[PDB]
Amino acid sequence: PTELPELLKLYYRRLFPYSQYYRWLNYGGVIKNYFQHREFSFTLKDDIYIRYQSFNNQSDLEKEMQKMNPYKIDIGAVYSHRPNQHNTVKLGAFQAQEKELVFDIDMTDYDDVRRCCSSADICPKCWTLMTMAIRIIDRALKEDFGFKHRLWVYSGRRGVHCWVCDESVRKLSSAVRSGIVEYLSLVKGGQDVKKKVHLSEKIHPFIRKSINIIKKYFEEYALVNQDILENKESWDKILALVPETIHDELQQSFQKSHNSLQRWEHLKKVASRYQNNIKNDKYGPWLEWEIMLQYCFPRLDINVSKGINHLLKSPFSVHPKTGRISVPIDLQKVDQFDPFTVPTISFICRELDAISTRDYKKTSLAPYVKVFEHFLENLDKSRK
Ligand SMILES: Nc1ncnc2c1ncn2[C@@H]1O[C@H](COP(=O)(O)OP(=O)(O)OP(=O)(O)O)[C@@H](O)[C@@H]1O
Ligand SMILES: [Mn+2]
Ligand SMILES: [Zn+2]
């Protein structure tokens, strides 16, 4: 904590990838005042922050960042005027106009289905949730919606962010954004609700494909690492998600079995023989899927995404509570992403001057900048 000022000064002077950052938020300079009308919000010492900050170009941003040395950096929306001049504008005229479509996934939202961590804690046993969350959401954005430019970022403590930056996506309204969220959402209800997933008879392709993703991980994550069917205290939470008329049949089988794998197979067979609708003789795995979805499907903080003017932490900003750097995630190596090897600001400041040019390529931050650059090159191609 007390070390942050001098470390931040070195970080913002020799390590922050300014050229790549400007390339991103300038979007080729094709539109006028697109970067000049962008809100940045800097958090300083003592939880003090300033909103409606904007800059004229890359140089002006470098000088202001090296002058303020903010603990945290938030990106806002592109406004109708210079945010830093918003007080000169007549009331009602200053309006948010465009912003990337953003998603924020917090591991805390899985506390009800996590047996290893709680609150802002994370560990390798439960990080697979984020692995599934990236694969499920990113597929839907890419394949179902046609979005081509998606930057996934480690938030620095307990989850991940996604920046969808296609120029028409940046123009979407709040209504369409919330509609996209609704399309993507399946786990609904707070701690009040016991069963948070309910499927229809007809399965929409989105649901099928997400389930097929979860099936690739469910054994190692849920039945081994989490051991969701370890004892009665654990498998009673799953029995709370199925009808009561099959509790007894499962209770016995679980006690006769010895581990979660066997008990899960019993659950699948029993659930597939349960008769939902007495009119027809139709049976299926709806319950099986509802359980898997309730334990593995992305839980999206809905309000982050519907608001055009919502602030989100900038990539390559530091998390002031962990010292970690918000780094992009290599989509080609999503399963191998290890949040516990993400460098802290102290670590890369050490690597810079550690004896065995003086920039980020001399540290462990480089490969993450390469991920960011591949993202930027795809954007450049889309413009040509
Ligand atoms: N006080 C605040 N005012 C305005 N925006 C705020 C804010 N505190 C946070 N935000 C914005 O919400 C994003 C998500 O919050 P959180 O999930 O707690 O932080 P994070 O950046 O995702 O990092 P983690 O702790 O989740 O890993 C913030 O990024 C943004 O500032
Ligand atoms: Mn978050
Ligand atoms: Zn954990």
Side-chain angles (χ1 to χ4, degrees):
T2 57
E3 295 178 357
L4 279 175
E6 64 178 318
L7 297 172
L8 286 164
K9 184 178 181 183
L10 177 54
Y11 179 73
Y12 294 133
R13 180 69 185 96
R14 300 297 180 185
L15 292 166
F16 188 88
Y18 286 109
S19 296
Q20 296 85 341
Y21 198 69
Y22 182 81
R23 286 173 56 197
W24 177 30
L25 302 174
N26 192 35
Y27 289 107
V30 293
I31 303 174
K32 175 171 174 177
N33 290 327
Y34 206 78
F35 177 83
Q36 290 67 22
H37 290 191
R38 175 75 77 164
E39 167 182 34
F40 295 89
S41 190
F42 292 175
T43 301
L44 307 174
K45 284 192 192 181
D46 305 326
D47 290 332
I48 302 172
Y49 65 93
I50 297 176
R51 285 199 58 184
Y52 298 132
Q53 300 177 154
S54 43
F55 317 99
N56 301 310
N57 53 26
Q58 175 168 344
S59 172
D60 191 31
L61 174 65
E62 297 186 24
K63 295 179 178 176
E64 279 291 333
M65 280 175 58
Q66 300 172 358
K67 176 180 177 182
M68 303 305 299
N69 299 297
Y71 282 27
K72 178 201 189 174
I73 294 184
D74 289 330
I75 298 171
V78 178
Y79 283 81
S80 49
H81 312 88
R82 290 177 177 89
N84 57 26
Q85 300 296 343
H86 79 111
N87 280 319
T88 78
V89 180
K90 63 169 186 173
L91 304 182
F94 186 71
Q95 290 288 348
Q97 297 192 330
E98 297 188 23
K99 192 180 77 66
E100 296 81 356
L101 173 70
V102 291
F103 295 95
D104 177 12
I105 302 176
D106 293 333
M107 197 85 69
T108 311
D109 295 340
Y110 300 84
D111 282 341
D112 53 337
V113 294
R114 268 198 304 177
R115 298 183 78 250
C116 54
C117 303
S118 64
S119 178
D121 290 331
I122 56 167
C123 77
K125 277 190 168 188
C126 58
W127 182 256
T128 305
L129 291 170
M130 298 299 167
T131 295
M132 293 178 295
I134 295 172
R135 288 179 86 91
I136 288 172
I137 299 302
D138 186 80
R139 188 213 61 78
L141 299 173
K142 178 191 177 190
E143 296 181 359
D144 299 1
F145 289 98
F147 304 156
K148 295 180 176 183
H149 311 290
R150 310 166 307 283
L151 178 72
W152 286 90
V153 181
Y154 176 59
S155 63
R157 184 177 61 177
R158 58 175 186 182
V160 301
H161 303 153
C162 179
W163 298 80
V164 181
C165 308
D166 299 63
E167 68 178 303
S168 73
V169 173
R170 309 196 311 264
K171 302 175 180 177
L172 294 175
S173 70
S174 294
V176 180
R177 292 167 195 256
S178 61
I180 294 172
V181 169
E182 285 288 340
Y183 177 98
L184 293 169
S185 290
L186 283 165
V187 179
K188 301 168 186 174
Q191 302 179 13
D192 159 47
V193 189
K194 302 268 284 182
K195 189 171 181 59
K196 295 175 171 58
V197 186
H198 294 89
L199 298 180
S200 308
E201 177 177 329
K202 294 179 179 179
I203 301 300
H204 186 271
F206 169 79
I207 302 169
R208 177 179 307 108
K209 294 182 178 184
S210 299
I211 290 166
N212 288 349
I213 289 172
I214 291 168
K215 280 181 178 181
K216 296 176 190 170
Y217 300 86
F218 191 74
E219 190 181 68
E220 182 184 356
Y221 162 78
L223 307 183
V224 179
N225 295 3
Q226 295 293 313
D227 211 15
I228 60 176
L229 295 161
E230 180 179 11
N231 47 57
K232 183 188 174 61
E233 190 270 333
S234 54
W235 74 50
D236 278 21
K237 302 170 179 176
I238 292 173
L239 292 176
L241 312 179
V242 308
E244 297 175 344
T245 64
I246 64 172
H247 281 174
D248 304 331
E249 186 177 353
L250 296 161
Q251 283 283 8
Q252 307 176 22
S253 297
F254 290 170
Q255 291 152 6
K256 297 181 179 179
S257 297
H258 299 311
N259 53 18
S260 293
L261 302 167
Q262 301 167 4
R263 292 188 252 266
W264 181 250
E265 294 293 337
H266 277 290
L267 182 145
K268 288 191 292 182
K269 296 176 183 176
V270 174
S272 69
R273 297 190 305 264
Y274 173 81
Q275 192 180 21
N276 302 275
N277 194 16
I278 316 177
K279 292 180 173 61
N280 59 31
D281 305 318
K282 182 171 287 188
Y283 307 82
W286 295 282
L287 284 170
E288 174 188 323
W289 288 347
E290 288 169 352
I291 298 169
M292 290 197 293
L293 292 164
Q294 182 151 352
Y295 272 70
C296 306
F297 194 83
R299 304 185 186 200
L300 301 168
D301 192 348
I302 57 171
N303 283 339
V304 178
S305 301
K306 87 174 181 180
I308 298 176
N309 65 336
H310 189 276
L311 294 171
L312 189 59
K313 175 187 269 184
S314 169
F316 294 100
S317 178
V318 191
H319 198 308
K321 295 181 178 179
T322 66
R324 308 272 172 167
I325 296 179
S326 306
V327 294
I329 295 168
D330 190 333
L331 293 177
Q332 302 305 299
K333 310 171 187 175
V334 64
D335 294 334
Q336 289 85 60
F337 182 79
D338 184 24
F340 312 102
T341 49
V342 171
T344 64
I345 186 175
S346 177
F347 192 87
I348 57 169
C349 283
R350 182 84 163 88
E351 280 182 323
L352 189 58
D353 303 312
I355 305 300
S356 58
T357 55
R358 193 167 175 264
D359 66 323
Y360 61 85
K361 291 193 173 184
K362 204 180 175 187
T363 76
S364 55
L365 188 72
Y368 304 102
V369 181
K370 188 176 181 181
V371 173
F372 193 47
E373 285 172 345
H374 173 255
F375 160 84
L376 292 174
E377 292 170 15
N378 283 358
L379 272 167
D380 279 331
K381 297 177 184 177
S382 78
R383 298 186 294 262
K384 191 176 183 175

